[PDB]
Amino acid sequence: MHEWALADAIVRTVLDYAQREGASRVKAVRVVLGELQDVAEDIVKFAMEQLFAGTIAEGAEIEFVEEEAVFKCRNCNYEWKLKEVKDKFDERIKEDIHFIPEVVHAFLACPKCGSHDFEVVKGRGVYVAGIKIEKEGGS
Ligand SMILES: [Zn+2]
Missing domain, CATH: 3.30.2320.50 (hypothetical protein PF0899 fold)
Incomplete structure (x- = not known):
């Protein structure tokens, strides 16, 4: 669209x-x-x-x-936002960061458990x- x-x-x-x-x-x-x-x-x-x-x-x-954006891992039902920073990017001023949708996938992997195969809840x-x-x- x-x-x-x-x-x-x-x-x-x-x-x-x-x-x-x-x-x-x-x-x-x-x-x-x-x-x-x-x-x-x-x-x-x-x-x-x-x-x-x-x-x-x-x-x-x-x-x-x-x-x-808010994601929910369908493997451990955990929910996280991009700014979550379980592991905060080198730049701690998290609000400061702006992701690029076409290459955001690389940063998408459930933090607490394994990774991927999530569900996009919002965003x-x-x-x-x-x-x-x-x-x-x-x-
Ligand atoms: Zn998970």
Whole structure:
């Protein structure tokens, strides 16, 4: 799922909610993207804006948030995050580190037990966390 299919799905999730809610405008959208995603975030925004043009979501502020990766070894059921550092990389300022998804696999091996054949619990998908809208009418 490249940036275009991603933006298309996100925009569809936003406009659908706005439709059933009877919204008159979409003010903001918060999107969470896993750190394992290889998509270029500015392209996803660029595509979202192009799909929002002429809709009630035109002008909506878009906020992207990173979701840390979390794995669960299906051999010892242990759960760890990349920053875990059971063995902390030479650089102790762990928050300081940024992994590259295309070559992250080498660092993936369960710390407490053996290694590999894990399950990705978080940090892989993309999802809309919140949508801010405006509505009119009532009494
Ligand atoms: Zn394990």
